[PDB]
């Protein structure tokens, strides 16, 4: 807190910057717990106040029910709230939220198979499609394609995509059959 106050009130001090680079780690550790607000002080000047935020308070604030309460409060203030009553309504909301989070802290005491089946179906069907290409015995077709034939090569080019489409159909059928097995 001392270092943060000094750095913020002396924003262009290289000597203090050196201390900041000496003390990233402590500042990084204490970053979530360092509260920072600005107030109009007794000297008719805007002053910045540093305080401690507790981990339990932060978790209670971050719980979704409090977030929904905050959203409702903000909606109400923006739509049907004035400027004179704004900071009184905000303080009332803060008090209610603080009491609720304290009560929550007090009361607190100190698909997967369907995805696996889809992955298995993908692996199995794609491996079946890989076996035909990796057979290594394609010498029987280099037999017929020893001489360049536009028609033959176009036919093989289409046949590869037809095989891919058939493999996709098999994968889809397997995914269904697995889903029926899982649900029943």
């Amino acid at each position: 807190v001392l270092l943060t106050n000094l750095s913020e009130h002396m924003p262009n001090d290289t000597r203090l910057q050196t201390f900041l680079e000496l003390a990233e780690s402590v500042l990084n550790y204490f970053q979530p717990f360092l509260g920072r607000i600005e107030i109009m002080g007794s000297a008719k000047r805007i002053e910045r106040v540093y305080f401690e935020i507790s981990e339990s308070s932060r978790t209670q604030w971050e719980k979704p029910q409090v977030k929904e309460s905050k959203r409702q409060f903000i909606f109400d203030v923006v739509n049907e709230g004035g400027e004179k009553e704004k900071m009184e309504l905000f303080v009332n909301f803060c008090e209610d939220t603080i009491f609720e989070m304290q009560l929550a802290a007090q009361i607190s005491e100190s698909s997967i198979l369907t995805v696996r089946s889809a992955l298995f179906a993908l692996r199995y069907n794609i491996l079946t499609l890989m076996r035909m290409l990796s057979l290594k015995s394609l010498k029987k077709q280099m037999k017929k394609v020893k001489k360049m034939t536009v028609k033959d090569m176009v036919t093989a080019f289409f046949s590869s995509y037809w095989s891919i489409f058939m493999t996709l159909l098999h994968f889809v059928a397997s995914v269904f059959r697995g889903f029926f097995r899982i649900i029943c």
């Binding site: 692996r123 090569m153 080019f157 891919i164």
Partner: protein, 362 residues
């Protein structure tokens, strides 16, 4: 030999990639032609034979020619998609995997959530030697190595990313290698990276647009066994025309609210069915002949189906269909029942649907 065959293959791939969209629209035009021909299709009488009647006598061959052309164009559209759009999908997937590896440590610090299909499938591509095949950052493995090697074990990271260190060290040192010509079929089959192609095909199979085009092709194939399956291709106008997408977005924008409104309508109609089944059973006779009554609310399921099917579609509600309540001890109760049904179901909820559509427009 292999050079010229690869050149012709590249020419074919480029042709299909260039003409992907033109064949995409030609398929829709052929589908409209086929369905316009089908508008002249008649039943003839014992199994019925669906028959085509025409004065010119020419459209029957036209139907088979158009069906064959549509099937060929669908296959060509699949080829054009695989030539043109698949590289972009693979590039984006490789970019996402690389950035999650580098800046998030998705497979070093944390692990996939065990229910993320693509997150679990992406473990395959990490070990491959053909990683950033499409993505430009070929140094992603070196970057991940520099970031996470010392803390998590450099050998461990090397095994995770598939990089070999002994071969690198020996190639940096005195290394003797003998070139092998690409012309060898065994050489090309050893050079191809099976694991990377496996992962690529997994990504393509999981792609949504490729699945839609495969469904299109399957429907085109089924159209030969039954010509009326070609009507399913008319659902492609949504993707064919951009102006129709605005009209459709006027509905899909609030689709969740639209479904929830139907669920609420079903619940309200079920409550009305409960009330009618408990108090107003006598009024649900739908038989004009007195000998055989046709009571529609003597069973919970039958009464609910009667309500949901007839009263909702009726202009004035369930009272248009159920009998008259005059001269009965429950007359006022049933009048309230009918009026409230008309007001809440026919007027308000349908107005909710209307307002949802108009609000989506606005």
């Amino acid at each position: 030999f292999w050079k010229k065959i690869i050149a012709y293959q590249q020419k074919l791939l480029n042709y299909f990639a260039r003409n992907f969209y033109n064949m995409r629209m030609l398929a829709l035009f052929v589908a409209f032609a086929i369905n316009f021909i089908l508008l002249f299709y008649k039943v003839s009488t014992i199994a019925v034979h669906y028959v085509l009647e025409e004065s010119s006598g020419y459209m029957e061959p036209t139907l088979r020619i158009l069906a064959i052309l549509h099937t060929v164009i669908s296959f060509f559209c699949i080829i054009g998609y695989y030539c043109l759009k698949v590289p972009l999908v693979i590039f984006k997937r490789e970019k996402e995997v690389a950035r999650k590896l580098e800046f998030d440590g998705l497979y070093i610090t944390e692990q996939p959530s065990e229910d993320d299909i693509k997150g679990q499938w992406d473990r395959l591509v990490i070990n491959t030697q053909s990683f950033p095949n499409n993505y430009w950052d070929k140094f992603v493995k070196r970057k991940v190595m520099d970031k996470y090697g010392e803390f998590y074990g450099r050998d461990r990271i090397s095994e995770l990313l598939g990089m070999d260190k002994a071969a690198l060290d020996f190639s940096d040192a005195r290394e003797k290698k003998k070139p092998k010509k690409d012309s060898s079929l065994s050489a090309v089959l050893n050079s191809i990276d099976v694991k990377y192609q496996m992962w690529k095909l997994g990504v393509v199979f999981t792609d949504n647009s490729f699945l839609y085009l495969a469904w299109y092709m399957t429907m085109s194939v089924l159209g030969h066994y039954n010509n009326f399956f070609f009507a399913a291709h008319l659902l492609d106008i949504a993707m064919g025309f951009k102006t129709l997408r605005t009209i459709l977005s006027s509905v899909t924008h609030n689709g969740k609210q639209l479904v929830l409104t139907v669920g609420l309508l079903a619940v309200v109609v079920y409550l009305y069915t409960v009330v009618a089944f408990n108090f107003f059973r006598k009024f649900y006779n739908k038989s004009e002949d007195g000998d055989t009554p046709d009571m529609k609310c003597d069973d919970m399921l039958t009464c609910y189906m009667f309500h949901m099917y007839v009263g909702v579609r009726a202009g004035g509600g369930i009272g248009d269909e159920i009998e008259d309540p005059a001269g009965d001890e429950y007359e006022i109760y049933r009048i309230i029942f009918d009026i409230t049904f008309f007001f809440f179901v026919i007027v308000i909820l349908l107005a909710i649907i209307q307002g949802l559509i108009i609000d989506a427009f606005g």
